[PDB]
Amino acid sequence: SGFRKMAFPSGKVEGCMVQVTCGTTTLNGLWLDDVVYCPRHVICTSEDMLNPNYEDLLIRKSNHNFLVQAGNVQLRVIGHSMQNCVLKLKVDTANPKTPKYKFVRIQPGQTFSVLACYNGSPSGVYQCAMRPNFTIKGSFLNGSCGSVGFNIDYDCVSFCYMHHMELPTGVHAGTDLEGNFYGPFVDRQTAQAAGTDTTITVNVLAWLYAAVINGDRWFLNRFTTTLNDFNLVAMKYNYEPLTQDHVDILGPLSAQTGIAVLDMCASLKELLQNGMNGRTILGSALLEDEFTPFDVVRQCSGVTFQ
Amino acid sequence: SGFRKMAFPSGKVEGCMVQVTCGTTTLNGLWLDDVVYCPRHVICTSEDMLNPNYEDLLIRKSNHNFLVQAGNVQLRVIGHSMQNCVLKLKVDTANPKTPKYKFVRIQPGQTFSVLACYNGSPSGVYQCAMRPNFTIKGSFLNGSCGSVGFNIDYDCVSFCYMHHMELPTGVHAGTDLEGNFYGPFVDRQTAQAAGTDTTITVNVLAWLYAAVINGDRWFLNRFTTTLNDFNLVAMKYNYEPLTQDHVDILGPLSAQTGIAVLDMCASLKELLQNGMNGRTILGSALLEDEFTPFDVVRQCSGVTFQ
Ligand SMILES: *[C@H](O)[C@H](C[C@@H]1CCNC1=O)NC(=O)[C@H](CC(C)C)NC(=O)c1cc2ccccc2[nH]1
């Protein structure tokens, strides 16, 4: 029993982190096979960062300009290219610790583990969700760029995120491993807006199911509702609209608990309309939206990887 | 910027987890050098667990009764002993992945990372605090026993916790790596009480400092207070009393932020007396007590390990 925000074990990713230095800027890169991947803004001076012409800046660079260090060892750069907002450095040595991996672009509302790194050394791990507005609520300081987000499926690491930026609102933005930003952001030193941060309704419902499974049922009420009526409440509270595919997703959880999705929608409606009256659910005084249905199932049925 | 519950990278510990089977009971063991450590209740039948005589039960066991599997490989048990509530199995093979390690017994209020495991395979990692009442608020199912808690200091893994039990209240109990329980608990299948769960006052203050550092300052008030007066509020709210050593601990954070500890105590007093008025601090509608001063500093100054 019990329900916690849980990250994937981080050992397969730890072995892939390197340090990348160009001039004075140091950040993290990901070393898979004979390629190191890092944020292209590593080539920027403090001045360049305001309005960079990355193509011109990259032109002035040669292989030997890039110091790629994996521990106390220097890798030899034999090639470089820019892909969207990521730099790919070709090196002469395949990473002997390369795990089975793929690059994926995750959808809003999905979760992943971040391995927060500095100077190519892992610092810590935590779980994040890609918000509907394509930001994450992380913990990142200067030096953290190039830290990656990932899921583990079997023995296969799916990399989905590389860290680039912090927004004025204190949230975080970055790219997939092909260098395309999640959301509207650009890699330039300007204050940028993510827009309204809507709540991941399906995730909240998953978490309510988790609560029930774990014996917290006080918020269950006598009422039911309809999708359209529920959503008419959702919209008001900046909740993502609930689709029928969302209902299909929640199906196993509904089935395991004996509680209809629309009944749970009704209980949620009351919580939105009434708040929680200074009570808690799974130790929180707020509705939590950063667990997927999958996350709930896996944690409530003790799934593993290796 | 940003502040998250963060675990240590788990790679050095992943390589130390094995599976231990005796009869039908399977759980996790920790494989360091030529010794595997696991909960002694692995030797129990469902019946035995009610009122076990571990010495008698262990007598009926021989080396060959213990199946220790590290991946698809069986280790050879050449010796067994009981130390308090932990079994030590001597095996013929030193773990080639043994990290630099020590066993420590942590104090109430300190944090550690849990690597939650099933069948000797890591499932996930999260941060916990040892509560004043010697429990932790984890996520553990049947099969999780033998999962370990740890800190990383440099390249040295300090193991501090092994999982044994879930209490009626849904919290968790276990031992140090010498097999002495944290708290009053015993390894028998009886409902056991942890007693009043007091709040780690010094940790709450650390977290308020973290909030300030991160720009959330709304709860700062115009007032100051004294230790004795503050504590007279603490006691009422089941907060651990604040000592002067606690003040010394918070010294750097006070110093970095320009906010006196007793001023912060005053702000805390108002929050205890007034609540939060449906506002949040670092994304929480509750006062958080599972970050140490050290945790705050390290996360706010990006400390690393490898
Ligand atoms: C890379 O390590 C670093 C990560 C951030 C530093 C603080 N927290 C972080 O997550 N990224 C940057 O420093 C980037 C670099 C640009 C060129 C992509 N800049 C920003 O995050 C940035 C610039 C800026 C300007 C106004 C308001 C916010 C803001 N954020």
Ligand SMILES: *[C@H](O)[C@H](C[C@@H]1CCNC1=O)NC(=O)[C@H](CC(C)C)NC(=O)c1cc2ccccc2[nH]1
């Ligand atoms: C070991 O994997 C297992 C871990 C718990 C199962 C559910 N969640 C857990 O964290 N530990 C046990 O099953 C132990 C075994 C005893 C012999 C030490 N038993 C309990 O946790 C237990 C027994 C019991 C009886 C009444 C109320 C609570 C309670 N918990």
